[PDB]
């Protein structure tokens, strides 16, 4: 199951200064980018146009171009009506797209956050405030719903365009979406954090797709004190992850980091702490120091 996401970032500094930038994602892969300075939507993959014809794409760009312009005019005018009068800076974020399910099943969404707080959603045929949203937003919403051409366009974008586009996008970029990128692992140690203890770090990088398994082992015994870190992105559209183990002095012996990932094909990365492969890696990764931790 995949989720197609159009992430719009709008920032208003004053009655003259504004900026609207968008990024598009199909899962964890970037498909498009539309920066304020660029008049057209730019493709970030060879398959970003999907199975749309050049005429089809042009028609879509033209309306998006009209939208960006009109959206700036519309907000700048709704800022005057908003209370308290002109609360600059104004941060509007828009999250629109569709989630694909097996068959012809799909579910579209359009969510809006004002000052980083989710306030409005497009639901069915109208724009609506979400529970908790500030009561002053009800009037600009009533005003927004008066635009018959906007509600009709949003309805076609969400109901038809989005799933139809994504269907062809998944087909066009399947090779790139189903790519298997092999992880690479390495070890390190730091004196953190309690006295007489040493933290053992297991670095895992360059794996795709996202799901992994990284565990510190003492033979077949899974060491319960393993702290898995967050998934950190790499520029080449791969992933980085690390697992830490806090151990007393001398307890390092017999420990090993085990890495399980889809691209490996059953041939798990096993790095033995103390081993010649480990000494030979340590030897080329040295630096001049003493350790500091902020976390």
């Amino acid at each position, epitope marked *: 199951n995949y989720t197609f996401r159009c992430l719009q970032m709008s920032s208003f500094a004053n009655r003259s200064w504004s900026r609207t930038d968008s990024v598009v994602w199909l899962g964890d892969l970037q498909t498009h980018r539309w920066s304020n300075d660029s008049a057209t939507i730019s493709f970030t993959k060879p398959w970003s146009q999907g199975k749309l014809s050049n005429q089809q794409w042009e*028609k879509l760009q033209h309306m998006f171009q009209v939208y960006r312009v009109s959206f700036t005019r519309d907000i700048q005018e709704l800022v005057k009506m908003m209370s308290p009068k002109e609360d600059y800076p104004i941060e509007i974020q828009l999250s629109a797209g569709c989630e694909m399910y097996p068959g012809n099943a799909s579910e579209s969404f359009l969510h809006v956050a004002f000052q980083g707080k989710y306030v409005v959603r497009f639901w069915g045929t109208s724009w609506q405030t979400v529970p908790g949203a500030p009561s002053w937003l009800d009037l600009p919403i009533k005003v927004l719903n008066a635009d018959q*051409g906007t509600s009709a366009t949003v309805q076609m974008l969400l109901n038809d365009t989005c799933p139809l586009f994504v269907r062809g996008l998944l087909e066009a970029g399947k090779s790139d979406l189903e790519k298997q990128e092999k992880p690479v692992a390495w070890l390190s140690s730091v004196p953190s954090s309690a006295h007489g203890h040493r933290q053992l770090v297991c670095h895992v990088s360059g794996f795709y797709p996202k799901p992994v398994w990284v565990m510190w082992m003492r033979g077949d015994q899974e060491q319960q004190g393993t702290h898995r870190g967050d998934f950190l992105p790499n520029a080449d559209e791969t992933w980085y992850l690390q697992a830490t183990l806090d151990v007393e002095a001398g307890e390092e012996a017999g420990l090993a980091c085990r890495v399980k990932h889809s691209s490996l094909g059953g041939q798990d990365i096993i790095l033995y702490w103390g081993s010649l492969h480990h000494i030979l890696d340590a030897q080329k990764m040295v630096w001049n120091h003493r350790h500091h931790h902020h976390h």
Partner: T-cell receptor
Amino acid sequence: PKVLQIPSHQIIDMGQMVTLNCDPVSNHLYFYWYKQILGQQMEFLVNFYNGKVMEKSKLFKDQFSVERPDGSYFTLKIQPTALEDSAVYFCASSFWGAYAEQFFGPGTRLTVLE
Amino acid sequence: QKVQQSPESLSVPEGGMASLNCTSSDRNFQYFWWYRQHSGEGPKALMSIFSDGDKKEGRFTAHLNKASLHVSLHIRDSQPSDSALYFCAASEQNNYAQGLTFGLGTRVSVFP
């Protein structure tokens, strides 16, 4: 707030060049031309936006030319003219290219005679 | 034909009722518009109808059933002002720059 067309009626001889003027609604972006035969069948001809043709029907011959220069009417030229071109030509403008109301003009009654 | 309309012509008494029917032959041409042209003038859109069900605009209601590609128009309390040529236009699904696909139209005559 209304699409205007000059002239109301026009009588032209075969082969001659004819220009059908249209003043769309202010603030409208997408412009159209329709052909209506005997006050019955309404036929789409051309969609014009951003200074270029966005869509054209099979009825839009090589004789037909469409343009909108800055500060002048959205026009439709017919060169050369044929007897079959005798119809009512409708100008239309909308805020959008699709799913929004198209505003029609009074039309120009073109009459190409032998 | 792409947009089939019925009847060819209809005659309704003043204050009476008139039902107009319209069917699309193409599954992509599922979004409808009801236009009305008074003899010797440019047509005026009555209403759009893009979602299934009824859309009531005063004396006028348009019903849609995308499943069966059928759209209809119901006129209540027919007035002489309603005597015109009623057009059913269809818009192609997921196409942001396109013309209108008009049917042959229904000639409605409100008689006293």
